[PDB]
Subunit: 244 residues, 4 copies
RNA sequence: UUUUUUUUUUUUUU
RNA sequence: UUUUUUUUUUUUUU
């Protein structure tokens, strides 16, 4: 009945630091977890999850993250395959609940495979290898997707780590402007402000150990035995420093 | 059938100023009323309204004003708590009917508790206390939310009142640009043009007396016994003058 | 079966100028017709249409063109009145089919009455009389709505006609920027490019004769017996030439 | 349960280039096919498809590509004709599935008839022939629609082909800015970047042979017996060079 | 904002 | 586009 008094009496109770912090942790933003993606893939796909994840990586890389929209301009065969994949994995577009699968999340969780596919798929990506070669010669094809950040060892020596991320950022700059048309008229620093947080989140995630991530970088020819980046990565990193 | 004659005859009847003014008052915009928020909280929550309002203040401050959207990136436990809060209090996003509760309205109506929570929640807010400290040292943590304006005594001496509002405006400038991305490229004066009207409406509302508001400012350490602002408030008020 | 041949055979038939022009006229854009608005008002409202149109003019002028949205911030009494008006007249928001009523269309069709209401409603409009007085002293209150263009005699001498339209355009410039926030950063010429076509359409409509429109302008004190605009209109027209 | 091991094992299997490429082809973007448009026209219309396609070309050229929206501002007769056309041909707006007809697709597939209609419809198009005449005298009326690109012979001698495309591009520049308001503040090169890919796709499509296309250009008076463009085409090609 | 943004390739329809 | 645009007034929640 006395609303002012009800508000004052409510304000009278002091803030319990322990209780309030327990609530902030409970309500906190839950970041991308590759384990949840693989769990959902296994749950919906069973023994077929790996073969279907290969198909979804090709869809994510060559057609994007909108399953129903990409179906509108597709062959009868492709349309039937994507329809079955949407029904089975309850595929959604964009950025929904973490209880949902997307083509981008499938590609991000299985980063090791995604980055290998990029060598073959190079000329069918939103920004082709040929386009990247015109900006920096022999541009590393394995860096040509945002999921590459999930293969980056954060324990690498500072300069070597910055060179890998700058090289990858040269792709991220071109890619973001092609798939996001409002970034086309913005500066390198403005476009970078949209991709650095999800890139760093992938670099610093606990999915795939530091050692296994460095083994991938070495196997793909991005770093040597001492973790020193290749001449192609150094070129791409310098091309990023110069880039508009 | 003779529409021109009907329009002429309609325009011929003299203007009844009493009738027109009665309709302007009847159709007038209905401003925010904290009493209605607390009434709805009591009606839906019963004996649980205060414990649930504490939870909703943590949600408003650390996750925002979109209950269904924040649930998409939350733990199973948090998701279950927010789901129950939405169902019980019929929580809506944005700016709906005044018959509806929102997390922002709960935080605004119980501004006294909201501002106390800010000391503990400082590093989980869209603009942290550490960021505010880099603009003005020992920035008042109690001013780091738009609901703080509801704790401002408009009867304070002019210079003391301007110092409190300028200090608080230093936060509102950073906060508005972080939560509203189209304001990021606009000047201090353009951003201020989006927060001054709701700020002044809270400062001049009839909810919580001038005396009780000044008791809160004194207890939060913002003003002394004479209503003179703290050195920290003065430093922020001055820092707002040279802020871009 | 032979799609190329089907396309060529279709292209072989020559375009019949008479037939094609009959189709362009049939499919042509149908402009605003005040007769259709009054007919719908009479059809839904019966003997109550005139009293309800007075209410809808007050709603259009002081709250805008979104019946369900304005109801969200309104008294129980006002909410009940607008709810009844929406159900009875099947009121829609924005720019729907010409078979539908809107608050803006009601105000536009009964321009004579709308412009008289503006003298009383001046301080409750999106751009007040006081605001207009600061740009041009004793700004004509009868010109303070887009529906005023429906009271303009196009047969007036050129200079007198341009002076009335320039004076009214000074309001249209302020009004368009207030109700349309994307026009706020645009030049006078860009803002004018959004209001000149609907303004000219109202000036050149066949609803209310040239003579009756000049009688309204004379009665409201906008032009003298010879159709020469008042000193206030000339000031407003010069203030428009200068305006940013 | 061991998600890191599952992701490592998945990334360990060698890339089957044959399998991946089979999936890129299956999932590849399906371009516009005029044969599919005519097939759907025949399937839904039967013996009435040609008479209805004439009506749909008038709608596409004078009212646009939004069937339900154009109906909102149309006569009772036109509204009834468009309602019947939407129901019969399951007409959609915008850019939907290739299994769907649109007014733009009907006009594009039967480009030969569309371009003939332009001579009669000139003053009812988004950019009129009179406006085009002010930029380049006696502007070719047959080029005043994007579907004209479907009548261009790519086997024409280089200079003659460039002259036809530059002349047509003078229209596409004006047209794109009128129907797309965000292009109004952009440069000639920025606007051209939105129309060159669909233009070139029509120029290089396999629908209607090179020889039949050149027969259309000759019959429309655009090129002589040797494929040399008319003086009017040359003047427009030259006017495109200095266009802003 | 915190692995997001998924654009073009007969579109954009003011 | 062709009587449209209906913003603020505890909002904007990235």
């Amino acid at each position: 009945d006395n609303y002012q008094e009800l508000a004052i009496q409510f304000a009278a109770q002091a803030v319990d630091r322990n209780e309030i912090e327990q609530w902030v942790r409970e309500f906190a933003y839950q970041g991308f977890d590759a384990r949840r993606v693989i769990e959902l893939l296994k749950q919906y796909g069973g023994a077929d999850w790996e073969k279907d994840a290969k198909k979804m990586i090709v869809l994510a890389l060559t057609r994007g993250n909108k399953p129903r929209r990409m179906m509108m301009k597709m062959s009868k065969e492709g349309k039937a395959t994507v329809e079955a994949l949407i029904n089975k994995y309850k595929l959604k577009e964009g950025n929904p609940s973490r209880d949902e699968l997307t083509l981008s999340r499938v590609a991000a969780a299985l980063a090791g495979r995604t980055c290998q596919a990029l060598v073959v798929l190079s000329e069918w990506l939103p920004v082709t290898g040929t386009t990247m070669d015109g900006l920096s010669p022999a541009y590393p094809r394995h860096m040509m997707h945002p999921s590459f950040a999930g293969m980056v060892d954060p324990s690498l020596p500072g300069d070597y780590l910055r060179a890998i991320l700058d090289a990858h950022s040269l792709y991220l700059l071109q890619f973001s402007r092609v798939i996001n048309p409002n970034l086309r008229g913005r500066t390198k620093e403005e476009v970078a402000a949209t991709f650095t947080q999800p890139m760093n989140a992938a670099v610093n995630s606990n999915f795939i150990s530091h050692e296994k991530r460095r083994e991938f970088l070495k196997a793909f020819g991005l770093v040597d035995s001492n973790g020193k980046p290749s001449a192609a990565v150094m070129a791409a990193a310098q091309a990023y420093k110069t880039a508009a």
